[PDB]
C-alpha cells in the first residue's frame, strides 16, 4: 500500500548515504557487497570478526588471479 | 532548572547571543556542579565575539588596504566551519549533555584560541607589515597550530606576491594605499 512503499524509500536513502561514507573512507566495497555486510550487522555480529574475513577473502582472490 | 534548559542556552552563547548572560558569561537556582561547567563552556562563546568584532569593525572602513582584506576575508572561511559545527550540535538537542559537549567542543576551543589571539598581535598593522606579523606565529612547533597559521599566511601573502610579480615583470606599481615596500615619488 503506502507504509510498505515509504519503507522502501527510507532504505534506499540510508543505503545511499552509507555508500558515501564508504567512498570517502576508501573501502573497496561497492553497492552490491555493501548490502550484504549491512544485513549481517543487523542481526548482531562482531565487526572485528567479520572484517577479518573480508580482509582474508580479498587477500586470497589475488593468489588465484 | 533542568539540565536540558542549560543545553538550550549554551548553544546560543557559542555565538554571542545570550539564563546565561554577558567579561565572563556569568550565569544566574541550580547545583554547583552545573554552574562550573557552564562557565567554561559559556566563555568559549565570548572568544567568538573578540574574533567577530575585528572582522566587523575593519570590514567597515575602506582604509585597511589590500592585505588587510585577504586577512579579514580569511577569518571567515575559518568561521563558516564553526557555523557548521553549531548546525550539527543543534540537530541533536531535540541526546547530548554537558559532559558530552566537553569532548565535542574540545578541539574548537583551540582554533578559537589561536584566532582570538592572532587578531590581537596584529592590531594596527596594515599592508605588508600585517603579512609579517601573521608570519611571526609560525615559529611555534605545535603541529596543530603551525599547520593552521601556515595556511592563513598562504592567503594573506597572496596580495603581496601580486604587487611583486607586477613590479618585477612590468614595473608598474599601483597601490593607492601605501603597502608595497617600493615607494615612488611624484
Amino acid at each position: 500500500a503506502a507504509a510498505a512503499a515509504a519503507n522502501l524509500n527510507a532504505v534506499r536513502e540510508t543505503m545511499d548515504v552509507l555508500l558515501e561514507i564508504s567512498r570517502i573512507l576508501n573501502t573497496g566495497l561497492d553497492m552490491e557487497t555493501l548490502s550484504i555486510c549491512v544485513r549481517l550487522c543487523e542481526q548482531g555480529i562482531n565487526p572485528e570478526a567479520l572484517s577479518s574475513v573480508i580482509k582474508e577473502l580479498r587477500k586470497a582472490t589475488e593468489a588465484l588471479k | 532548572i533542568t539540565e536540558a534548559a542549560l543545553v538550550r542556552d549554551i548553544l546560543y552563547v557559542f555565538q554571542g547571543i545570550d539564563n546565561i548572560k554577558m567579561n565572563c558569561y556569568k550565569v544566574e537556582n541550580l547545583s554547583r556542579s552545573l554552574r562550573d561547567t557552564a562557565v567554561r563552556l559559556s566563555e568559549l562563546g565570548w572568544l567568538h565575539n573578540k574574533i567577530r568584532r575585528y572582522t566587523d569593525q575593519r570590514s567597515l572602513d575602506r582604509s585597511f588596504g589590500l592585505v588587510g582584506q585577504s586577512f579579514c576575508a580569511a577569518l571567515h572561511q575559518e568561521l563558516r566551519e564553526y557555523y557548521r559545527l553549531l548546525s550539527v550540535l543543534h540537530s541533536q538537542l531535540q541526546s547530548l549533555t554537558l559532559r558530552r559537549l566537553l569532548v565535542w567542543t574540545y578541539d574548537p576551543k583551540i582554533r578559537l584560541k589561536t584566532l582570538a589571539a592572532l587578531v590581537d598581535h596584529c592590531q594596527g598593522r596594515k599592508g605588508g607589515e600585517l603579512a609579517s606579523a601573521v608570519h611571526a606565529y609560525t615559529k611555534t612547533g605545535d603541529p596543530y597550530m603551525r599547520s593552521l597559521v601556515q595556511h592563513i599566511l598562504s592567503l594573506v601573502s597572496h596580495p603581496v606576491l601580486s604587487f611583486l610579480y607586477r613590479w618585477i615583470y612590468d614595473g608598474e606599481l599601483e597601490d593607492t594605499y601605501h603597502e608595497f615596500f617600493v615607494a615612488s615619488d611624484p
Binding site: - | S33, R99, L102, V103, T140, G141, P143
Partner: protein
C-alpha cells in the same frame, strides 16, 4: 545532607558527583581546595566509601597538573620543543575527556556502581600518572630545547619492562622531536642555522674556531656520541658557500647512520675545493 540518605542510594549521588571532578570542574560534596591538589570529602559519610574515594582521586590530582602544564608551556618564550611536547600531550587529554563522557551516558542506565568505577578508569590512572610526572620534572629544572629532549629519552629507558608506558613515552619523544630534527636537516645538508629561540646545539658568532661553537647543555644525550661530527659537518659547508630526512627511532640508529652519510660528503666537497 547525606546522613539522612540510605547507604545503597547515596552511592548514586557520589558517583555522579565524582564523575565531574575528574574533568576539572568542582563538585557537590567532594570539593577541591586552593593551591599537588588537596581535596575534602565529607565530615559525615560512610567510612566504607571514603577509603575508596581516596583511591579514585589520584587520577584527578594527577590531571589538574597536566592541564596546567599545557596552558603554560605553550608560551613562545619556551622554545620549539616545549611546544610540540605540549601539543602531543594534549591529544591524550582529549581521549581522557571521551572516557568521562562514555561513563555518564552509561551512568544514566544506572549500570555504573562505585565498585564498577574503580575498574573502568584504570587505563587512565596509569597514563595520567606518567604525564603528571614529566610535567613536574620538566619544570623542576628549567628545561627548553635539547635538555627537554634528553629527559624524554631517560624516562623512556626506565620503563624498559612496562611495555605500556614505554609505548607512550615513545609517542611523545617521536612528536616532541620533529621541530628539533627540522633545524638539523638545515645545518647539515646546508649551512644555515635558523634557531629563533636559543635552543640548538650549535650557535654562531660574529678567527674561525669562534665562528661556530658547541653549546654543551642543549645536547640531546642520544646524539652525544656525534656532537663533534655535526659541528664539523656544517662548518665545512660555510667556508665554501660564502666563497661560491631524519626520524627518531628507539634501539635503531637509522639517524646516527644518516648523519655520517652527509659528513662523509661535507668534507669531500671542501677538501677537493682546496686541492
Amino acid at each position: 545532607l547525606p546522613g539522612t540518605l540510605p547507604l545503597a542510594s547515596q552511592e548514586s549521588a557520589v558517583v555522579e558527583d565524582l564523575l565531574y571532578v575528574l574533568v576539572g570542574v568542582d563538585g557537590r560534596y567532594v570539593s577541591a581546595q586552593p593551591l599537588s591538589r588537596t581535596f575534602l570529602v565529607d565530615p559525615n559519610l560512610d567510612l566504607s566509601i571514603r577509603e575508596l574515594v581516596h583511591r579514585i582521586l589520584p587520577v584527578a590530582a594527577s590531571y589538574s597538573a597536566v592541564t596546567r602544564f599545557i596552558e603554560e608551556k605553550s608560551s613562545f618564550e619556551y622554545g620549539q620543543v616545549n611546544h610540540a611536547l605540549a601539543a602531543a600531550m594534549r591529544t591524550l587529554v582529549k581521549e581522557h575527556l571521551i572516557l568521562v563522557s562514555q561513563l555518564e551516558q552509561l551512568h544514566r542506565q544506572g549500570l555504573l556502581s562505585l565498585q564498577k568505577l574503580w575498574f573502568y578508569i584504570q587505563p587512565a590512572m596509569r597514563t595520567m600518572d606518567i604525564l603528571a610526572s614529566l610535567a613536574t620534572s620538566v619544570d623542576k629544572g628549567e628545561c627548553l630545547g635539547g635538555s627537554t629532549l634528553s629527559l624524554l629519552h631517560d624516562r623512556s629507558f626506565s620503563y624498559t619492562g612496562d611495555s605500556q608506558a614505554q609505548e607512550l613515552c615513545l609517542y611523545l619523544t617521536k612528536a616532541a622531536s620533529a621541530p628539533y630534527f627540522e633545524v638539523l636537516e638545515k645545518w647539515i645538508y646546508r649551512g644555515i642555522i635558523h634557531d629563533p629561540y636559543s635552543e640548538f646545539m650549535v650557535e654562531e658568532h660574529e678567527y674561525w674556531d669562534q665562528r661556530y661553537t658547541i653549546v654543551q647543555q642543549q645536547i640531546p644525550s642520544f646524539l652525544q656520541k656525534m656532537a663533534d661530527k655535526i659541528l664539523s659537518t656544517g662548518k665545512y659547508l660555510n667556508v665554501v658557500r660564502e666563497c661560491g630526512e631524519i626520524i627518531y627511532t628507539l634501539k635503531e640508529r637509522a639517524y646516527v647512520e644518516q648523519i655520517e652519510k652527509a659528513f662523509n660528503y661535507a668534507s669531500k666537497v671542501l677538501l677537493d675545493f682546496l686541492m
